[PDB]
Amino acid sequence: QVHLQESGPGLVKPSETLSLTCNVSGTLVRDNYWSWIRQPLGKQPEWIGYVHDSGDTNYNPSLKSRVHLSLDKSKNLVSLRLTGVTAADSAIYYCATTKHGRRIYGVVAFKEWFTYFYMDVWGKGTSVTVSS
């Protein structure tokens, strides 16, 4: 039994430094990897990426402009912040864990392997919309 709680003001003004929070359930953040998924209403989901402390802070290459992920070990909380929200940001978000997976197709010393990630579990999420 895994459950989580999110937050959000519901209505977000344009061009505002929106902040989002996501808690944990039992599993600590040090020994786990978290990922965020953005899905437009009725369309295919879009993957923001994965964030982890101590180096593994890779973000989405397509945007790489205003995304900022932070972690709070004391509070066991992970925060997602965007600066300068637009009208196309109205979508459902999901914070959930992920599991690694390895595949080798060549020489062990010549970098013929890419790690692939699959999300065993998914979060409940919270609706975010922008209006005037």
Place this chain on the structure above:
Amino acid sequence: TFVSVAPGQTARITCGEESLGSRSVIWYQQRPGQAPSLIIYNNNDRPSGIPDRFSGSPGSTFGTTATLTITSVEAGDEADYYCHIWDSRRPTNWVFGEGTTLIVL
């Protein structure tokens, strides 16, 4: 991208582009009003909690396309299916493919 299959029959789902290089396909499902879940976590390996009814193609194919075969469609199969390709040629794609909404009569 809508597929109509009668209950108890076989179904084929086509997703992804041509098989230029090796793939590690990941299969996902979306339930209306409910959180997603997982079915297949590798090219052919599957997790616990699901029987061996599901099947998939290996990643050692060149020039082909990833496909999913479903047999004995039940009432609980009504969900949107998504595919996630993982190629060694192209970088990691952060956008999923054309989701196939499989509807059951």
Place this chain on the structure above:
Amino acid sequence: GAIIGDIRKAHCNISTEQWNNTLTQIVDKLREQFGNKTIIFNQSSGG
């Protein structure tokens, strides 16, 4: 034309113990013609 396989550079496969097997042989014989692990194998300077 193009590549339709996998990006894997050419490589050669020699066993790991064979090179030591032949090493001890030439080494032991080298102790006769040349003064007797003082044997050093170094790459060529180049050119």
